Design a protein around this nucleic acid. Structure first.
Lengths: 221, 221
RNA sequence: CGCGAAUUCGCG
RNA sequence: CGCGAAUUCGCG
RNA sequence: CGCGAAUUCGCG
RNA sequence: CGCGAAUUCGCG
């Protein structure tokens, strides 16, 4: 296909089986029999490994407390899209009109790499170098500027300020258990949408509620 | 023969560098800045990959709905402990005798393969085979035989009947999500104790709840 | 112990 | 319905 | 679990 | 209509 060649040209790899490359680009809404779903599964574990290995090598601090935040960002939907954009993935994806979104691009990106892996005769070392060739420069850049992930409270506040010029209100509902290992439950509220959050401290609880309240706000669109 | 050599043989690999192999086997509580924390962080990613590649290649059903639960069981410390028996890590692991539990063994399991990976000049392929060499059948064995999920409810019932002669009471708290994928949340209670659980079905939720209820039904009387 | 039932939970 | 478990009741 | 059905939502 | 998710009722 005139299109597959281009995508291959960008990756610097030619598939020994065009049906495999095509499968990774095909969404379930295009072909109920052969879609990226399964490769997506394998790519998740694959890309995860590539990124985690780059992290433990180029991170100024090796402790888990430090590395965890960075990983959360590196394997996030957001970042995967940035990297998928260097290939213009949306252009080559085969899906039904109006069903595409950022969650999808992120997955085909994962599947895409599971494809190369398998098509290269499951050669891990090879796939990894190809991946770094195209993205190592970008990954080390994120690690260096400490790019983390915004917590739910900050995200919620922005969402609710973008739409209503208002901020949610958290309130303490109840307290329970023992004094040493206390249980908190807070209520996140915006307009008339409400969610509850449970946790060890008032803050963590709020973080939970905010996360919930964000899900709720999504569907109300 | 030395401790290491004894393991290197049961592992089928002779470390170029001994320090690395002995680091993966150490617990901070013994070696202040020479424990497996970091290696474990990479090993996790490395092993999750080794498994996922094997799972999506030989699994009967290659649907994400089917594989997802299988994975959870395959990379669980619970399972890693079973695989670990092949080596009896609970014999070479260096630690202040009196804290070595199940989790630690798992972390060491992951941390070990990370050591192999590095000492092998970071040859994922090589390390992967060495892995299948030892655990391929075991994994395949568990992949197709099926997971005999733990019946927390009945167990929980066998306890409250033993200590209070009264069986537990479950209670639905909420139901969220689209009707094609509802997400339940139930609250299990006994006498004056409470715990929550959530799942794709009431039964599932009831289990996740009767579970946490047991973990806490041992932190009192 | 065996036989027959009940209640509850689980699996099929 | 069947199997299993727990706790009961009856019979042998 | 198997048989017979209802309801809601998703997918062909 | 057929698949699939969830919730139920009758029978075995």
């Amino acid at each position: 296909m005139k299109m597959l060649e281009q995508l291959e040209k960008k990756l610097g790899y030619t598939f020994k089986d065009k049906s495999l490359l095509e499968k990774a680009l095909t969404h379930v809404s295009y072909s109920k029999k052969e879609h990226y779903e399964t490769l997506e599964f394998l790519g998740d574990a694959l890309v995860n490994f590539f990124i985690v290995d780059l992290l433990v090598q180029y991170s100024p601090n090796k402790r888990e407390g430090f590395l965890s935040p960075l990983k959360a960002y590196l394997i996030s939907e957001e970042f995967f899209n940035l990297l998928a954009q260097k290939l213009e993935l949306h252009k080559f994806i085969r899906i039904k009109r109006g069903k595409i979104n950022e969650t999808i691009i992120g997955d085909v990106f994962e599947a895409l790499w599971a494809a190369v892996y398998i098509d290269s005769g499951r050669d891990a070392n090879f796939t990894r170098e190809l991946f770094y060739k195209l993205f190592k420069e970008d990954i080390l850049s994120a690690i260096k500027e400490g790019r983390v992930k915004k917590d739910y409270k900050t995200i919620l506040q922005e969402i609710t300020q973008k739409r209503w010029k208002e901020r949610p209100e958290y309130r303490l509902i109840s307290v329970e258990g023992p004094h040493h290992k206390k249980k908190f439950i807070v209520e996140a509220k915006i307009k008339e949408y409400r969610t509850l959050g449970e946790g060890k401290s008032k803050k963590e609880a709020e973080q939970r509620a905010a996360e919930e309240l964000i899900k709720l706000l999504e569907e109300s669109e």
